[PDB]
Design a protein around this ligand. Structure first.
Ligand SMILES: O=P(O)(O)O[C@H]1O[C@H](CO)[C@@H](O)[C@H](O)[C@H]1O
Ligand SMILES: O=P(O)(O)O[C@H]1O[C@H](CO)[C@@H](O)[C@H](O)[C@H]1O
Ligand SMILES: O=P(O)(O)O[C@H]1O[C@H](CO)[C@@H](O)[C@H](O)[C@H]1O
Ligand SMILES: O=P(O)(O)O[C@H]1O[C@H](CO)[C@@H](O)[C@H](O)[C@H]1O
Lengths: 292, 292, 292, 292
């Protein structure tokens, strides 16, 4: 049993004044709220019990939007990150929710799309020791945690936001950990940047010969919705796909329904209140069409 | 002296589940909140005293966001629309804020761009008797109040959302009224569609020979941000303009600064708290560059 | 050994007047000509000997753009389709180029993207008997050849452009055939619509128990660039991906280089003439970076 | 009488390999070929007699597409620019076509949109002495001819692509000239960059007190379609406008029809051959609808 964490906190300024009226993870990406994406990512990994971490001001809202998750067959819980001192704090804030289980952490503004994405998730989720992360070739690695490989395809280092990247592979914001993470996190010291870095956690596993780094090929799409532009590009990306397929990307109800975490009846209940619009209309159509 | 009303109420149902997270009028259009646009529209018309109407749940937010307007040289007030019974209710709800003055009403999801927009606004604003509206050729008139013209360019009828439009000219969501509006509004009867229609208000002025209908040419851009798609198209429209010009569209601070409703000092104060981002950076640059 | 055909003909009037200036398959999709996409598709399927079919007016151009293929390790040939009498004509027109080999046919305005696309293609290409096609859930099946499945996932019918589609699965424009196709094509009679239909070809295989229909999941992206809008959406789709990754989609030189159909030296030669721009810059960077 | 020139030459390597396939000024912007835009610009300025300059390979094509202009009430002629030695060569190459008349020069990849564009053009076109140019605030002036104003709104310098721009006002690619241009051009010496620069031509008029520089306000849109990205942004810009209005931007037939250069009958003839698609459908609808 792995548990999941969505870290959806974070500093508004960049987005201000657009986010003067809402946290970033509540803005829509095309037709549904941002947080549905990463949420639906953990769901496709088979994770049902998930803790959502946000700012004090934003928690109640997330809560107002997702509830406890029982309607989607999930078990959701919440917690607060008073101040943005590093993603790695997630493990401290979430220490008691994790207990002695396996876990996974996904950042609230990461958005993933692609064929067999669940088999890919599956490999990592099913591992029971060490940590796994993913690597994705990008144009501006400098903006991310960067991982270097040797000629044998083996990972040999990680640097966070380097001025001189040793490769073009970035480590995305989806991480799988075993039971050693909490403790590892407990010994970190704030970076100069003054944060507790997930990169440092990852490196720790690396220094022990226990970091697994799988490639996410160029056939997948990994987008981050952190700037006005990117938000827009992602919004257009989904809309292109959705309109072409007549299917939705990252619709939690559908995924729950497909994993048998809720049944045809629950699904109908979910749709009723949304019937006046396409979303509900979509949910309804799902009960009468096989989708492979 | 004309007073202004922004009707920003609204059953968010359509834009669901996104608006499950925030009223429509708080979502961003590219880089600032939707409401800035229509607000900036009244501003360009010379109007400083404005009432904002919204749902009960949304009011406090709007309030949290704009304040009383003093920082921008405005005088903002607020009111509630318990239930979406027609735009025309705005005049009842707003009867005492209007008093015996001229007024103007603009819908919160209407977005206007174009050269000399302000002279255009000015013609109407400066009229002191009757009402003025604007007409804009569109592809799907059926979705709007439609106005018909005779061979002489004169307006001869108005139908709201007709199955068979008599023209391709829609009447946009910006309206100027004299002192007769409140009483006219007092005698309306809900439409079948069960609402008090602005179109009925406009028709009343028409049946008296007092409705002025100016054309807004194809050289302007009138967009409504009421669906996921249109929200996205508008976001991309502004982004294209803003990135090309290095100027913003509908930035209230700038407009206040240009009308001399606030001075260089106040402007600087407004920017300080925003300095970490481009918005503030933008505001600052405005104090040292002449922009014709 | 399978041979390939790209059918890039037709008048393509849905794009008038853009195409008064060139054929549809020469217009760019973001940053390279349309025809590169399907071309690159056959290439990923392992196919090096390809016949390109087009209108009489367009052939020289294509021929002016791709040459004989030797620079990319291919063997390209050309042939004409005097008049748009059905995709199935491709097999008549191409009867002698096919000879007694296995073949594949891809339409010029179909564009494919996604993880493991090359294994997917590989399944079908390595089959040596019968036919294989792909089915893709879409919003408007009525526009395409539609395939229906039973409860057991087995295909049980094909209809071209039905008014009442039996499913939402469209058959895309990528087809794999054994040696029976030519003769099958020789016995077709023009449809009412007045064309020799691929759908009929497919049906013939079906009626013999020899049509293989694999599902292309919602994790892939199949777009057709036949209208102004779709052209534009695709362009923005590729641009989003390319700019995010620092990699190109459907760049024939790269693919040839990865299949060892050309070597580092050839690749360098290819890049020289393009050095003043990014495309060449891209090709150059490929010789010094490992890309998993 | 002013005569016009469209300089639509060059390689446009920035558009490789899309432009291998065809010259830049043939690619579509959304729904019609690029060259229609600047063409339609001169048309709105009242200019009917136009010389189109292009590369030797591209001329026949342009000629294949536009003819001699009689169908649109124009008089079109062609000439070649063997090598890209500066825009200013346009005046040499076009010396005999201009004769002793007033003239105007517009670059092939400049695109213009906005309210009263046609009065703006009119001011300049009706002047009969000196030269006029327009200035547009932009984000990256370094890329263009840049003009500096004094506190009094008066132009006081022009620099082409400066490393340190003295302002954010770029001079767009539309120029009006009196009879002194040819001779002025005859004395230019190639710039270091090895071109005969329009900026030098402009500067000459400036040094004599005869250069008029009008501001094109932020209410207009000036875009250039010289890169893949910009091409794509422009396409989406026009599509947003066209689909909202049910009207086209830069449709030469319409403009001819509105200036009475052709009549209803000619217009019908023009539409026939295009009836199978929207463009022609558009042209037809124009005969029965008044568009203010
Ligand atoms: O969002 P941040 O804190 O700038 O960066 C975080 O996000 C990125 C993924 O989105 C990671 O690659 C960085 O290692 C992580 O520190
Ligand atoms: O937004 P509604 O209530 O469908 O319609 C309202 O908005 C439109 C403008 O956006 C107007 O044309 C309608 O006449 C007005 O009734
Ligand atoms: O492009 P066409 O001739 O309308 O139709 C062709 O295109 C589609 C794919 O693009 C196929 O699904 C159709 O079966 C085929 O006939
Ligand atoms: O296209 P070019 O040759 O780099 O630049 C040309 O175009 C610009 C407008 O597009 C002008 O501002 C420049 O002065 C002119 O030389």
């Amino acid at each position: 049993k792995r548990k999941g964490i969505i870290l959806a906190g974070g500093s508004g300024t960049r987005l201000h004044p657009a986010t003067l009226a809402i946290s970033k993870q509540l803005l829509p990406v095309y037709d549904k709220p941002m947080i549905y994406y990463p949420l639906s990512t953990l769901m496709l990994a088979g994770i049902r019990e998930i803790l959502i971490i946000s700012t004090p001001q934003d928690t109640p809202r997330f809560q107002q939007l997702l509830g406890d998750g029982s309607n989607w067959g999930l078990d959701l819980q919440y917690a607060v990150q008073p101040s943005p001192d590093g993603l790695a704090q997630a493990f401290l804030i979430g220490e008691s929710f994790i207990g002695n289980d396996l876990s996974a952490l996904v950042l609230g503004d990461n958005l993933y799309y692609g064929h067999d994405f669940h088999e890919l998730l599956g490999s990592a989720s099913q591992r029971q020791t060490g940590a796994s992360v993913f690597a994705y070739h990008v144009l501006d690695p400098e903006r991310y945690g960067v991982v270097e490989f040797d000629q044998g395809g083996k990972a040999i280092s990680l640097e966070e936001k380097p001025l001189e990247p040793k490769s073009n592979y970035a480590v995305t914001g989806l991480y799988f950990y075993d039971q050693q993470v909490v403790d590892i996190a407990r010994d970190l010291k704030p970076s100069p940047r003054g944060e507790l870095e997930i990169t440092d956690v990852n490196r720790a596993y690396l220094e022990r010969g226990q970091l697994s780094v799988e490639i996410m090929g160029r056939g997948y799409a990994w987008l981050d919705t952190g700037t006005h532009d990117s938000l827009l590009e992602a919004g257009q990306f989904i809309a292109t796909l959705e309109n072409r397929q007549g299917l939705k990307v990252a619709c939690p109800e559908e995924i729950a329904y497909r994993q048998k975490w809720i049944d045809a009846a629950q699904l109908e209940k979910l749709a009723a209140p949304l019937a006046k619009n396409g979303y509900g209309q979509y949910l309804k159509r799902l009960l009468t069409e096989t989708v492979y």
